[PDB]
Write a protein that binds this DNA or RNA. Structure first.
Ligand code: ZN
Ligand code: ZN
Lengths: 200, 200
DNA sequence: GGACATGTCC
DNA sequence: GGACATGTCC
């Protein structure tokens, strides 16, 4: 069995997809999303709102997991972790282990997990349906290193894989998106989309 | 008493001064020295030959200490250390503590010291006079982080202070030089000397 | 070695 | 935000 989680999109029976806020790139903003690249550009430890959309309501006890993997085949097998510098920075919120790249803020039932076999990190919260009048649920993620962090992601792109899972562990839905954590999300999104057009 | 070692040049009664190899900058070389800037440019963990010159022979038991401090007044008080990434890299040679920035290679009597009061690191070897026919003694230093290392020197310039000390601890001589540890010593020396001329 | 990268200065 | 920085790609 593979030690690398599938990144394969699975809309599933509940019509699961992700949504992202608009947009830009007015200024080198804190967080911006490129539909063309399927890529979030954001800043170190800043809020990244991700929306969960479903057509049919998941059953009670459904959970939402986020996990990072390296996007490139050459790096897929390596566990995505915080670099040694940021790991020792004591910026923990009391819940997140200092090694974990991805945090969820503002959730009283967050769980941080480390796979006993793959050693990969993930963070889980309960799924909750939208309030009446709302079409989605929003989770605030934080990425606790820059993509460029020496001894950590080291300039390698990652994907965040979001899985919708029932109590029993059945996969109900899966989506994923590329992430670049950088100093200037607005600038870098512009640069990448222009290189896509010209050279892609 | 100051927790910051003096960088004040002291040629002393023995006529102590430093010498550096020539030069460049043919290519982005591994190690190059700028007389105008009093600055060594070198690469991570590569050999940096430093020559010790004296007019009168130091007495037996004389020692040679190297220590780094931040050059800028704003950073002088902070101890110069390896970054967390390089510290944990297990590149130790069996003698140097993994936190120490400055190593001496090729010396059977090297001592690595940490000041009980200032916590500053230094590395010491016995002073030895030149062989007959030679005008100097050469020590091979290594700098085990780049100047840019996140969580370490963090792009701040350092000075290396070389002290000639007798057995008893008397200061016989002192010299110092700025260091930039970088990927492209040749390129950066050229850039800095040109900015000195134009803007200095 | 030239171009590109990507965090920082101002 | 433009210029500069500084490690990396090729
Ligand atoms: Zn980091
Ligand atoms: Zn380092």
């Amino acid at each position: 069995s593979s030690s690398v989680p599938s990144q394969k999109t699975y809309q599933g029976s509940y019509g699961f997809r992700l949504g992202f806020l608009h947009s830009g790139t007015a200024k080198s903003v804190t967080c911006t999303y490129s539909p063309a690249l399927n890529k979030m550009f954001c800043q170190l430890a800043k809020t990244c709102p991700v929306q969960l959309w479903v057509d049919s309501t998941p059953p009670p006890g459904t959970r939402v997991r986020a996990m990072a993997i390296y996007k490139q085949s050459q790096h897929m097998t390596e566990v995505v972790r915080r670099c040694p510098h940021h790991e020792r920075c004591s910026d923990s919120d009391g819940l997140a282990p200092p090694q974990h790249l991805i945090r969820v803020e503002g959730n009283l039932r967050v769980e941080y997990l480390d796979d006993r076999n793959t050693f990969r990190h993930s963070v889980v919260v309960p799924y909750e349906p939208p309030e009446v009048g709302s079409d989605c649920t929003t989770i605030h993620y934080n990425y606790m290193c820059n993509s460029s962090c020496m001894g950590g992601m080291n300039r390698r792109p990652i994907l965040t894989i979001i899985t919708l899972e029932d109590s029993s562990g059945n996969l109900l839905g899966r989506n994923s998106f590329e992430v670049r954590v950088c100093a200037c999300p607005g600038r870098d999104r512009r640069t990448e989309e222009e290189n896509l057009r010209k050279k892609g």
